[PDB]
Amino acid sequence: TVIITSNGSLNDIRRFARQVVATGDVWHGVSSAAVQWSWDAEFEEVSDDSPEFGQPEIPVKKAQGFVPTETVALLFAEGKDELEAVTLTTGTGQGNQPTGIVTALAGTAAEIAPVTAETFALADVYAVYEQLAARHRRQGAWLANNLIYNKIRQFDTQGGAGLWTTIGNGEPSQLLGRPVGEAEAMDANWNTSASADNFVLLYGNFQNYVIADRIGMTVEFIPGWFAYYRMGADVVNPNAFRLLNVETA
Amino acid sequence: MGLTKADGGYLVPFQLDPTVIITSNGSLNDIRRFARQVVATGDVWHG
Amino acid sequence: VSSAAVQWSWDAEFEEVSDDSPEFGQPEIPVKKAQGFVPISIEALQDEA
Amino acid sequence: IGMTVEFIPHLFGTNRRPNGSRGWFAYYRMGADVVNPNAFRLLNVETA
């Protein structure tokens, strides 16, 4: 056997995200907006209310690796899992990479500044949860790095309305009556980090983040070993999330 | 022979999800579960 | 033996794969000895119970 | 041999590494000639 010395990565996006099987190279959908009504008087001509339609688009991309038996399979699988996790958490979207949720949400109206500049408090969690629309709010999930959850644990000192759980207990399953997910590939500090933007928390309806899968992990033998894998992902509705951004300067 | 159209890209079939997605925020309200409701039969209701 | 994971990459169509080659280490654990001895007399062995 | 189609599962790039493409090979063998030239008649028109 072999002892793996790589840190690896963990991600829970696929636990909540919507997965659809795309037969072709590109997946297509249809978006719409509701009709507009008005209060009209008697014998008044009704206003024209033609709806507008749109079409999202999901290209399918390709990731492959090559080594010039079961040991090789495991070494391929670990790298595949790590790459998939890091890219789903954040992918540049441009070039040859699928779009990640953090990349696709930056610059959208979903981005929110904290109540106190360069500070993480209990008001920020409630602000992220409450600014979302009710339809998406009642059905959604969280996502952050474990450092953030530990900081949340370290808010209650006297036992008030901050007692998520006590020491000697595992990581609680629910936060504010909602499922909790974690991802090692999210920023968790703003002091030592040299970046201006720090996206640390996320909450929203994850059925609006569509991941399209085409071909699973396949391994061949050339008389080296060749393996490749295809997927694609992007966001349909950008106003079903509320991303937090601590801004340093 | 790539996925470009002139190199065999015309062969792939167009894929579409027929179901629709509504991007409007909508609204939720709870007046109707607390308020009193009456059945009008004309144009006005008097009391 | 110990090793690391293969570094996958995002490649376009008709793009040659990178030279992804892992490396294998070798931990070293020798075995060592501990011992202790006590002598006893014949008279003591006969008398003491 | 008649027309035969052979499938190549892997192609390689400049640096002799796979580039994610496959191949289709086909070959044909034939030969022909004339034994008796005198047993044929051919009409030729020479236009200046």
Distance to chain C for B17, nearest Cα, Å: 26
A35 close contact with B: CB closer than 8 A: no
CB interface of C with A, residues 2-31, below 8 Å: 2-13, 17-22, 24-25, 27
Distance to chain A for C37, nearest Cα, Å: 40
| Beta strands at A197-199 and A243-247: parallel, antiparallel or unpaired | antiparallel
* Best CA proximity match to C6, nearest among A81, A229, A215, A69: A81
Contacts of A42 (CB under 8 A, 6+ apart): none
3-state class percentages of chain D: helix first, strand second, coil last, to nearest 5? 5, 25, 70
Resolution (A): 3.5
Residue pair A206/A40 in contact by the 8 Å Cβ criterion = no
Position of tokens 């694609």?
A232
Q: From the centroid of its chain, how far is CA C20?
A: 27
Distances (CA, A) of A75 to A10, A78, A82: 16, 5, 11
Position of tokens 């391929």?
A76
Q: From the centroid of its chain, how far is CA B34?
A: 27
* Best CA proximity match to A187, nearest among A57, A89, A60, A81: A89
In chain C, count H helices and then E strands: 1, 2
Beta-bridged to residue D11, according to DSSP, are none
DSSP labels for chain A?
Answer: --EE--------HHHHSEEEE-SSSEEE-EEE---------TT-PPPP----EE--EEE-EEEEEEE--HHHHHHHHHHHHHHHHHHHH--B-STTSPBPHHHHHTTSTTEE--SSTT---HHHHHHHHHTS-HHHHTS-EEEE-HHHHHHHHTT-SSSSTT-S--TTS---SBSSSSB--B-TTS---SSS---SEEE-EEEE-GGGEEEEEEEEEEEEE---EEEEEEEEEEES-TTSB-EEEEE--
* Best CA proximity match to A245, nearest among A202, A194, A193, A203: A202
- The angle formed by the CA atoms of residues A172, A175 and A179, to the nearest 5 degrees, is 85
Residue pair A62/A96 in contact by the 8 Å Cβ criterion = yes
CB contact under 8 A, B17 and A23: no
A126 vs A176: CA distance, rounded Å: 9
A65 vs A213: CA distance, rounded Å: 18
A39 vs A22: CA distance, rounded Å: 44
Beta-bridged to residue A219, according to DSSP, are A227
Distances (CA, A) of D20 to A226, C15, C34, D11: 9, 7, 59, 7
* Best CA proximity match to A25, nearest among A245, A248, A236, A231: A231
D8 vs D23: CA distance, rounded Å: 4
Name the neighbours of A, counting chains with at least 3 Cβ pairs within 8 A: B, C, D
* Long-range contacts formed by A32-39: CB under 8 A, 24+ apart: A32/B20, A32/B21, A32/B22, A32/B23, A33/B22, A33/B23, A33/B24, A34/B22, A34/B24, A34/B26
Residue pair C4/A6 in contact by the 8 Å Cβ criterion = yes
Single-letter code of the amino acid located at A18:
R
Determine whether A183 is exposed, middle or buried from the number of CB atoms within 10 Å of its CB (0-12, 13-18, 19+).
Answer: buried
Chain A residue closest in CA terms to D10: A222
Residue pair A146/A182 in contact by the 8 Å Cβ criterion = yes
A88 vs A101: CA distance, rounded Å: 7
Interface C–D counts its CB contacts (< 8 A) at 18
Q: Tokens at residue A37, please?
A: 């009504």
Distance to chain B for A86, nearest Cα, Å: 27
Distance to chain C for B24, nearest Cα, Å: 35
> H or E element: which one contains C6?
none
Contacts of C14 in chain B (CB under 8 A): 2
Name the neighbours of B, counting chains with at least 3 Cβ pairs within 8 A: A, C
Q: Which among C13, C14, C16 is the nearest to D17, CB-wise?
A: C16
Q: Can you say whether residue A202 is alpha, beta or left, with left for phi > 0 and alpha for psi between -120 and 50 degrees?
A: beta
Q: Which among D9, D10, D20 is the nearest to A64, CB-wise?
A: D20
Q: Provide φ and ψ at A104, rounded to 5°.
A: -75, -20
CB contact under 8 A, C11 and A96: yes
A59 vs A93: CA distance, rounded Å: 10
A19 vs A233: CA distance, rounded Å: 9
Chain A residue closest in CA terms to D12: A222
Strands in A30-32's sheet, in edge-to-edge order, are: A53-54, A30-32, B20-22
A233 vs A26: CA distance, rounded Å: 11
CB contact under 8 A, D10 and A66: no
Q: Which among A23, A24, A32 is the nearest to B22, CB-wise?
A: A32
Interface A–B counts its CB contacts (< 8 A) at 55
| Beta strands at A26-28 and A57-59: parallel, antiparallel or unpaired | antiparallel
CA neighbours closer than 13 Å in the CB half-sphere of residue A66: 19
Q: From the centroid of its chain, how far is CA B45?
A: 34
Chain B residue closest in CA terms to A23: B15
